[PDB]
Amino acid sequence: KSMINAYLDKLDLETVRKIH
Structure with missing residues (x-):
């Protein structure tokens, strides 16, 4: 889990979470 x-x-x- 580097890039x-x-x-x-x-x-x-x-x-799924830009506004709320």
Whole structure:
């Protein structure tokens, strides 16, 4: 988890939680 950890953090936080 060098490059993959940081990529998926912002992918899921913004798909299902951008406004709320």
